Amino acid sequence: MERYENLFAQLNDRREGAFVPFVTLGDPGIEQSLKIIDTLIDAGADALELGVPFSDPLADGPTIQNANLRAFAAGVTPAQCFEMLALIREKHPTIPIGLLMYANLVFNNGIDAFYARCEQVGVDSVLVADVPVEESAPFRQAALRHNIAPIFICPPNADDDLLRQVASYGRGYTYLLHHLIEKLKEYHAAPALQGFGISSPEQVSAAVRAGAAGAISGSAIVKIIEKNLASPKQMLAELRSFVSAMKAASR
Amino acid sequence: MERYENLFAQLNDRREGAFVPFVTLGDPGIEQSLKIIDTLIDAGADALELGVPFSDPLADGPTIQNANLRAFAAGVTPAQCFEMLALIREKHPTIPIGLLMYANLVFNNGIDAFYARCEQVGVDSVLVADVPVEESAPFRQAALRHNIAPIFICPPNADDDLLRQVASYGRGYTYLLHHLIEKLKEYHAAPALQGFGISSPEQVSAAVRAGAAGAISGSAIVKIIEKNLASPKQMLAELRSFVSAMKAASR
Amino acid sequence: TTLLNPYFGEFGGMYVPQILMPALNQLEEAFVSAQKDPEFQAQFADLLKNYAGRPTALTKCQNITAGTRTTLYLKREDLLHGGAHKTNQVLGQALLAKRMGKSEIIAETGAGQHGVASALASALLGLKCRIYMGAKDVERQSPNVFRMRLMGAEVIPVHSGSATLKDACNEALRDWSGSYETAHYMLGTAAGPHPYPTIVREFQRMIGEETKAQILDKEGRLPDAVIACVGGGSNAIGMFADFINDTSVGLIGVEPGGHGIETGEHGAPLKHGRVGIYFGMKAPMMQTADGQIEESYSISAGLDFPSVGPQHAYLNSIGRADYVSITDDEALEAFKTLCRHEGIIPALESSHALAHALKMMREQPEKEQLLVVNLSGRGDKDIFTVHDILKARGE
Amino acid sequence: TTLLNPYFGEFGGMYVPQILMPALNQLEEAFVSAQKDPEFQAQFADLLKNYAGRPTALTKCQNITAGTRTTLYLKREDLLHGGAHKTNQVLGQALLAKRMGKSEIIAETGAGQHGVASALASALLGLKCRIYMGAKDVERQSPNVFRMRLMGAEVIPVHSGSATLKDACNEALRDWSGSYETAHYMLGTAAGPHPYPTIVREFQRMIGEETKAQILDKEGRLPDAVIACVGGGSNAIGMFADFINDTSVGLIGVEPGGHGIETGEHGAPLKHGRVGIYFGMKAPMMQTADGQIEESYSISAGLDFPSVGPQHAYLNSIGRADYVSITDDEALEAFKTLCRHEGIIPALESSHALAHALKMMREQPEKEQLLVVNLSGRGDKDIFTVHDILKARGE
Ligand SMILES: Cc1ncc(COP(=O)(O)O)c(/C=N/[C@@H](CO)C(=O)O)c1O
Ligand SMILES: Cc1ncc(COP(=O)(O)O)c(/C=N/[C@@H](CO)C(=O)O)c1O
Ligand SMILES: [Cl-]
Ligand SMILES: [Cl-]
Ligand SMILES: [Cl-]
Ligand SMILES: [Cl-]
Ligand SMILES: [Cs+]
């Protein structure tokens, strides 16, 4: 499809950044999670970054760790996430849906088979957290074969070769982990989105101010889920209170 | 003095062996011990072998070990034993009194001073348990200087050089720990007394039968003291019941 | 781009978040530089000889092979300072860390032997050390938890997952992802992302080099087989490496069978797992049909790991090395047998390699064979564990 | 009559019941025979090298002497199989025992290191072993009580007396007085009746021989002083022996000061006892004014002994060797310091010798001095003891 292009063309012509919330699928339950994601969308999330619970999330803090164990306690499997994903795309035809995966869940039953499954349910992009561009060739080929954008992190310690490789290999959007925003607009690189420490409206604003095309709240939306496990109804309202405020800061 | 000579001349001309009980001084108390020793004498002990409680009796079984700890619990010191010894000689002018000592108690305040003290209280002999004839020169000189007989053990694994040395160096009596009884009568050795496993009347008899001049009950008289700590009066009667029987077997 | 080949056949790679690739490339260049540097080698050789105690003995077992045609030597890494082979390559990584200007050290440990080694090396060479350990392994390997603490290191129990080695590895790689600026991650086995499986092999290869020289001096020929337990792979590749091109020499790695392979409760992914991507590497692992990492199990903490180093997976695939498994009960009997008949108390890890050697002898007692078992460690850390087992079994 | 001189000056002798003199004379002749026998020496040398791990390293401490003119090496008997120097002379006595046709072994132990060594040697060379241990030392040295038991030996706690080393020695010499027919009494220190102080010295003298060769190779001159803890005397005479005729070399033995000499609670008879006759020897001991043996004390079980070997009393008397004392608290700080700044965990016994070396450095930091400390053992057996101490002290 063409979902990431059209989103960035609309937010540009609206003079607003992209707000992309992260949330792990099935946190804390399946039908509970679906209502969370609907509520993030209702309050104006421009796209979604969605995690699949993995056994050993060696690149994730304790908030997402317990987010994962919450879903495993719910009995959430990769198979169940893809049934969620098909249900979310069927409700929301235009919103870009991006996955944040661990390499083993992509590699497990066949790399091409995973990305084929992504296209089948309407996923737009996949960032594999523990696959650097040096190891990415079979992943980004399977991605591009199935009309999935491969996302790559542009780390703070990025050298110039990395910058060009990320510009060349990456589609959809660039995940910024001043000088770097310079050099990705350099080489026809997908729009950069800041993801380091966005848990306030006041850090979204600043990220849009520095020239990025958006910001990703890599967690503390999952802190909202954690803070209100026993209070489902209050969890939803408190979630909208957040994302509305953060999306209000996007402009 | 001449106490050992006269005793063996009397038992010979009586056609009877010597019965020599062992008992540790101050076991279980000082005035208690004195009554024990009087009672061993009343029932016909021909001589005495008396131990001084030592800290680490590395050549004594557990019966004598507790016999010693019984005396230390009583507060029995070497000094107190010598006051006992002077009191026993003052009651019993003719009975040979032999000490079984550990070398440190003899060496502690001067070897000559110890044997001088022995003569002063009327002791007749000293066997130092952990002084072999090879190490005995200063002990048997101090002994002979103060008219004390040095006693030496003739072990079961005795070679011929040992036999002659024991015959030459030893006075009073030989402590046998058939072929050996042969070879001490050989070389003008003091009368042999058996001390291995005499706790019955039936092992005294046998020892006299094999040509020895007597037998030493190295313990189980101290088992009588152990068996009757709480029953002082019954301890005395049970003690005489033993030694009378054992001395009855001497003939 | 790298200086060295990051893969062994299909296995290996550098499957880390992009943020850690500069760290991995920096370690690789420092390693290549150091390997070329006579002054590094002279310094590394000096610490191994005068501080750690190399060469270690090669001990011929007189008693346990009686009545058979097996001649069995034990390579005595149990005599190395610290009590295991771990100490060899931490001294080399510590020198590398100073070479890179790092002043902190991060480590994982399950048997506590890698934690002890990291701590002693950091104390010697003035580095600040922190170490992740499974809360389960804190308990069955408690002789090593004290030792790490009095040497000035921070021991951090980890309660996530199976509370075992895997879980500490996860914590440690998370920590280094933020702290790599000033800290070196002193990985404790021949696994993880390149260059670690290569570095750890080269800093352990003296085991096999010495063994070759010693067995030539004593027997006038090479071993028929060298036998080592395989947890992540460092002691075994350390023994194998110098024999790889000696094709007459068999290379046998022994994974923990735990309660028995058929029970699922084991640590033998090489032969009873399947290839996945985890801990920075593409390697055999024990994993659900979903691709979740299964939890491993072994009576020995040092082998309770659900993956294996990629050079072993490669050596297996081409047939150069064979891999087998040995159960808890088998390792315990080899432990008892070595204590009673040779007066050596081996690590329960090393007991797995001994157990397989004893099986090679006993199944074919008239087969003439010269065997070497890498005795990777001493079993003082295991005596309380072995006590409660044999007590509960009325033995 | 004997073949060798049983005394050192006034000290020594054979103060045993007559029944044991044939046993002592038989051991002496077998020893003299063996010392002349190249095949015994080649067999003893082989076990030391290929089973025990000799030579042991000589480690230069880089950190703990910084800022001073002291150069401090540690002779690493902590790297010997079993964890202490004890192992050296039990391998030689075990060979002697087989030479005499004995098949049982009796031993005493306080730190359990001699019990461990006796058990490992008996397991290796097929001897039946039984070992007496103080019930107090059963408890503070419990890592060694298990080790002895899985190697097939009988550990017999002794509750008489102070329930320490002295009390086991008493039991053992009582046992041998009846069992000497088939059993060898493998005495664990340079004390007791002749020929033991001589045999144990000669079977330990490789410590000092190696140290001389190593310090010559590394420094080109002999040490200013060699420093060893003194419990019964075996590690120290093992280090001293080859230096005795090198009169420029100081010989410093360190007795346990325990809670302080003035408290009476110590194990320093050489300097704070007086001569007596006990345990088959005439030697300094701690004794009442009555001549009862006093009970000794030290935080370290291996030094909690109220006498000392007669060669040390002799070397002291003629001025060849100096003897000093080091308190519990002093030894504990040396223990901590070695762990944190050199990454070696020393035995609390060996910590006494280290503590005095640290005092020699710190009292005179501009004094140029080349020192060697005999690190008699590793401190794994002490970590639980050191834990409860530093915990009760809020440290
Ligand atoms: C004495 C011994 N032998 C073998 C191994 C197995 O590890 P490799 O395959 O040799 O790398 C271990 C493990 N040690 C690690 C894991 O817990 C640790 O201590 O932290 C071990 O301690
Ligand atoms: C590691 C260490 N260093 C020094 C000594 C001190 O003994 P010496 O003077 O060298 O003979 C000991 C003691 N060991 C005996 C006593 O308990 C034992 O284990 O049974 C020790 O274990
Ligand atoms: Cl054989
Ligand atoms: Cl040959
Ligand atoms: Cl210096
Ligand atoms: Cl030089
Ligand atoms: Cs494993």
Ligand SMILES: [Cs+]
């Ligand atoms: Cs002492």
